[PDB]
Ligand binder design. Structure first.
Ligand code: NAP
Ligand code: FID
Length: 315
């Protein structure tokens, strides 16, 4: 089945296109190709600095009647410098304008960490530390709930929240809407069994980011593990007559996760979508899970001092 049921009653395509690092002069065509080939979920963010260009593609394909808006599932995130109650609505509307939408299917708090508002996405003090905001994530969550009540977003969620932070929202006094999704890093080197189990036990759908290991991450090093070239994973792919990437995408799908591989390459975009025609065995799945090494691509290493930094806790 191509979609999963959220706790807001809407359905979310379990496969989406990521857009972090997608160059602004390539991402319009990437999203047009993705929708042409059958993608119905696009994962976006203001901090990616390319929403206008993603939006151009979405609008053209609506205009062309390639797809209807009801059939698309568009996701964006609230960046850390906009956690203040007075800035949330504005941030959302700028993203909407850029994406040329009148609503988001899903809007996520991008990180539990709030930063000082301003032009800079990573505001620094004179000694190099990121400057935090005094806003806490419970007041940020209430502002996200307002967005629902104003019709700007159909669902709200969180990203990069650890289990104690998910729990804090779940136990927020006067909680109005629970989070629908927690978007976290997840791949065979970071399998996240504990956090996923917790979120799913709570009815919260987990989206797996960097499922291919983010080989274009800016800080990659030639000696890092490589999922795509791990011969153990190659072997499993070979056996199923699929590519390694296809295996890496099918893997979270069979854990009842949503997954959002990024590509701006038309051939790979199509490749990545042909994952609905084969099944990994239970054994394949346990084998993939065994490769966990708690290897994190996205650890926000410029702000490990934040009170709300999520990755000091085990999960
Ligand atoms: N919530 C957050 O904090 C957060 C954090 C990280 C990522 N994300 C989201 O998750 C998405 C996915 O993560 P990611 O961008 O870090 O990386 P990823 O999706 O794990 O990997 C993308 C890299 O893989 C390459 N690639 C894609 N398909 C391939 C295939 N079939 N064969 C070989 N190489 C392939 C891409 O190349 P080309 O593009 O050159 O084809 C690109 O270099 C992001 O784009 C973003 O939407 C969210
Ligand atoms: N260092 C990190 O872990 C995050 C990763 C991350 N990528 C992503 O998709 N979400 C993120 O927040 C990102 C994206 C940016 F545009 C800029 C910084 C950046 O930092």
């Amino acid at each position: 089945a191509s979609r999963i049921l959220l706790n807001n009653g809407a359905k979310m395509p379990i496969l989406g296109l990521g857009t972090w690092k997608s160059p602004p002069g390539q991402v319009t065509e990437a999203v047009k190709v993705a929708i042409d080939v059958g993608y119905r979920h696009i994962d976006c963010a203001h901090v990616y600095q390319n929403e206008n260009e993603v939006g151009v593609a979405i609008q053209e394909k609506l205009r062309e009647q390639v797809v209807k808006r009801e059939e698309l599932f568009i996701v964006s995130k609230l960046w850390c410098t906009y956690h203040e109650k007075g800035l949330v609505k504005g941030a959302c509307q700028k993203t909407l304008s850029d994406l040329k939408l009148d609503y988001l299917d899903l809007y996520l708090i991008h990180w539990p960490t709030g930063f000082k508002p301003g032009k800079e996405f990573f505001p620094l003090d004179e000694s190099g530390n990121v400057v935090p905001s005094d806003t806490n994530i419970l007041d940020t969550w209430a502002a996200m709930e307002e967005l629902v009540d104003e019709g700007l977003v159909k669902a709200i969620g969180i990203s990069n929240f650890n289990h104690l932070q998910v729990e804090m929202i779940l136990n927020k006094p006067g909680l109005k809407y629970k989070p629908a999704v927690n978007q976290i890093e997840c791949h065979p080197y970071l399998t996240q069994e504990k956090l996923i189990q917790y979120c799913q036990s709570k009815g919260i759908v987990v989206t797996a980011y960097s499922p291919l290991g983010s080989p274009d991450r800016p800080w990659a090093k030639p000696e890092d593990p490589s999922l795509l070239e791990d011969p153990r994973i190659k072997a499993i792919a070979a056996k199923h007559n699929k590519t390694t990437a296809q295996v890496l995408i099918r893997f979270p799908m069979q854990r009842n996760l949503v997954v959002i591989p990024k590509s701006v390459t038309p051939e790979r975009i199509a490749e990545n979508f042909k994952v609905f025609d084969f099944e990994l065995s239970s054994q394949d799945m346990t084998t993939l899970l065994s490769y966990n090494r708690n290897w994190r691509v996205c650890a926000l290493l410029r702000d490990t001092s934040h009170k709300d930094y999520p990755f000091h806790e085990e999960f």
